[PDB]
Design a binder for these strands. Sequence first.
RNA 1: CGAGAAUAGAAACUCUUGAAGAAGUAAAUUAUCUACCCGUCUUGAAACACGGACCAAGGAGUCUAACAUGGAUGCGAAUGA
RNA 2: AUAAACAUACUUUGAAUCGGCCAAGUCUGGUAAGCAGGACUGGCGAUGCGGGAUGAACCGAACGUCGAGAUAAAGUGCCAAA
RNA 3: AAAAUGAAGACAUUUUAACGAGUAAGGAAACGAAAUGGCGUAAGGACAACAAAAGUAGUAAAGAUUUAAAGUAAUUUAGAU
Lengths: 129, 173, 167, 60, 210, 165
Amino acid sequence: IKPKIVKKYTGHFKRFDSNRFLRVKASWRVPRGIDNRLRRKFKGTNLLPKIGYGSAKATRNMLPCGLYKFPVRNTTDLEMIMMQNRKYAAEISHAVSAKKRQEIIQRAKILNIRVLNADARIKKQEVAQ
Amino acid sequence: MKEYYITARCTDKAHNPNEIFRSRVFAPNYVVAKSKFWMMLKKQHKVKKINAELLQCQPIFEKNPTVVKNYQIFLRYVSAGGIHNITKQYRDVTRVGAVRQMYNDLASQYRTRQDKIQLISITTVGDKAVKNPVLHQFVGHHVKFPMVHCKPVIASKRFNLPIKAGKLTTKLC
Amino acid sequence: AIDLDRHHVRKHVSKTARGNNAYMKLLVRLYGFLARRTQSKFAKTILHRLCLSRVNRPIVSTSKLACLMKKHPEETAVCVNTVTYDSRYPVPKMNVCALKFTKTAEAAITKAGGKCLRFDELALKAPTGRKTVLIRGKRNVREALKHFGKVCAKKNPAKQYKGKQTK
Amino acid sequence: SKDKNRSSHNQSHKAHRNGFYKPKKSAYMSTKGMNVQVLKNTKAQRKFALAKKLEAKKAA
Amino acid sequence: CKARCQAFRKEVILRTIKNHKDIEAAKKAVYTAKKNAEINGDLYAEADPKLIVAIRIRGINGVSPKIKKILKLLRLRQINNAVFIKANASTIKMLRLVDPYVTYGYPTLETVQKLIYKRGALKINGNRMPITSNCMIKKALGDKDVVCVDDLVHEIYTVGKHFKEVNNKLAPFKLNGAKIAEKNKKIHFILGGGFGNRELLINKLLANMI
Amino acid sequence: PLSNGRNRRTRKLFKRPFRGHGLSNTSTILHTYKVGDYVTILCNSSIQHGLPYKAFHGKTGRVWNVNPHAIGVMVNKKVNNRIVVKRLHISPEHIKPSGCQKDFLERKAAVAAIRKQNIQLKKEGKPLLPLPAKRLPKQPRPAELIKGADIKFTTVAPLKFEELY
RNA sequence: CGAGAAUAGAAACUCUUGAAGAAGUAAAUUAUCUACCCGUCUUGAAACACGGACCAAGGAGUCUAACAUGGAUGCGAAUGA
RNA sequence: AUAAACAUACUUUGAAUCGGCCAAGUCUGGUAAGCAGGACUGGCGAUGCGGGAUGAACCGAACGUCGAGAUAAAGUGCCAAA
RNA sequence: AAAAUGAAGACAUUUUAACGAGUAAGGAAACGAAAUGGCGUAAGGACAACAAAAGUAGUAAAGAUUUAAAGUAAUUUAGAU
């Protein structure tokens, strides 16, 4: 069973004038200018982040697979979610070595925990190996 | 346009409670007819709605809306210069239709909107009492005219095509 | 839109204990339970007074309890505040329930044969409140209230915060 | 640099946000400035009634 | 136990029987008097309407302070909001002052029935709860001798002795839109417009609006 | 731009009534004012001493004190955004009894007249009369039948215009 | 003919497409609709008002002292020491 | 009569502001002004949206993100939905 | 906002109803039914594989560049180089 996840807006709320100037990044900032075209919500430029875009509470922070992300660092952190394998998916942290990644991936199979980084830091065994 | 027969009376120290006021008011609906009736009482007999009470307001229909009659309408209209009394003649089968003709005619010929005309009276005149230069020519017993330059008549909007085939023609009809 | 008189803003009534005190947080939980279940106006009153700020929970000396319980012999005083000791006057025998008791006040109450109770025993013994006397301390005695207003006023002058060249 | 001298514009709208505060009932019951004799008469009875109430308290 | 759910139902049937008796008998007497008045050649004056239904026709922007207060006293705080108003000297003058912002008239029995049945709601514990059952009506207006949805209709239509309390519990009706006027709502209905008193023609507007 | 004198803009307010100059009634100096009465402050410009301020003219206040020569009148004054209570001492020349409670004091007596008979009818066991019905705004008039015996009709129509000149 | 009430009954389905890539999402292009230069002073600026060629890094309500109100805390005719 | 318990009465502490401008079944000075100054109210400033081709103030109507409908001003030869 | 439930669930509980424009300006922290909710930078004190080897790291840290995912957003997360 997996509920239908509804995203009210899949675009990005890019900062005003970020498309014209390289010094202005794309991370959102509220236009506070007295004469600003966007904060006055003129026609055409009337797109600001509001709480009305908030996604449903039931499916908020839900991965496309229907589970939730649980960052793990070693084999013991898998035991924290072994009782909720239908709710949480493992996610090995970016700094975990390739050797420890094998133990986390191997143990998660035993405890039936889905891992979303199951193909990360694989050894040279792709071509002719 | 519709007719209504309205009666009312005033119950106060200035008017005896045995005087009944009647009228035959033309209006699109009975709410407008009552408002026209109450303006007459206020402007002529000092009778106000709060001090009076309505009795009847019932529609009047034409007895025979199939006989053509010559209607003579007496009216007064306010212009820029002042107020004038005008007599107009119309041919129709119903009283309400002729009054509808008068309002449309006055709004076009004299540019006078509806809220500047008061219909004093409307009677039926004889055949030879019609003085309108144009209307008088259709009153006789041998009126006959060929209608020319006719546009062909479309049976319904179903057959109304934007572009047709072949050539177009008028009709001696 | 709709032509409303005012828009919805938070009601300025406290509904829980202020601060991070674990024991006061539980007392509000206890009397919030009693007020909802027993539906007694006594528990609603105690629950409401538990959520007041420290300046709205004025102290009540033992002399106030002595005077207010002269004609309530087999009764229990219930003040949701600290109970101080009036060293000028004696303490008769009486039962007091309060949030806190001064070390010298508790000794004087107990030495006279009375009992200093807390609000968990009072709810255990008199949950709805049967032989209780509700008491709150005076609020207008605060010396801060004297400086509120205009001191130039003709009717009720303020008290002129002292400072430079005060005569 | 001439300026507009005065205007009552927006003044009634301002005065009705927090509307006209009525005086409390205790404002109408003030006694200062009353008749001298009536104050003398009232004080005499209040003193008499209070002194009679207090002797009952001593009795019981 | 749930035998009360029985005796409650027969009471509603009995009260609905009585209420239709009251309405039919009044319509009975008026018809007979009108017929008899023609027998003797007399004149019969119909009774002035006691009930008025008013619809707020203009928005909340640009209203004089006096009109603002009256529309709040009539509970017409929103466009396309409808209420029931008792007719007397005080309210009729009160309605005339706010004429450019409302339209009103005299409702029929069917209009009162359909308005309450489809848009009815009661203010319970500060909540605008729509009407779903007779049990919720009894819980609110039971002390006013109103137990079901038919006494609600009868008391409003006949303007009974408990109109003020029963009407106040009724939340203002939120209506749909409709073709408001012939010319526009900037002139009186008498001049062919949208606002003002429509008398019995308010029913046509409500039929398209309910 | 007016001045700020005490009696500014008082050409017509302080003018005596037409054919009403000179001495006043003696009922003005003989009326009995008791504490709690309703009075109307009316600045009589014929008496310049003790003339109340022109802003209190025509206001209805209540008697709060009675002195040998003056009557204490209490009125409400509107200030910036509040209302304050003003306590004046005005001679009987500048005040006048108010009829603001004339109708109410009759209704008070009407209900007390019925209440007096009720306590006597209860002793005899007969049913007791009800209190007078409360005032209502003009109610919708009921249906009434009009006899056609003494009725007469007069047609009402628009009138032909006639030039006044 | 028939409200209430009492007595008994009858609903658990098809088809098409998808790892030879479904549904959704993103990127580029085209098309319809749509979009005046930001900051600031100003009654009012897109302004023929001023600053701004571009990018990185730095960059502006802080600290000491006196008073007051207020939210949390200790003790309480004492508190601090 | 009507409305009003997220009513009502407030208390304390404090911010910003006191260059304003517009409309008109209003007024004064002026020949007059997109001029100067006022009384009452609604606005713009602080405000986007639909319409008036364009427009701070006009008309409709005030705004969380959306779907389906009845509408308002106003429109229905084409640009432009009818 | 009101009811209901409430030692720990969890998504800052459940239900119902009303509401949501905004310059200047205000809403410090803590407060279980929480007296607004949060993101980011750096340093300090703790905590971080509970059975005596106890967060990650030469089986590749920080940083850089892009690709995808989560969040209304501030931002975070992961892959590849």
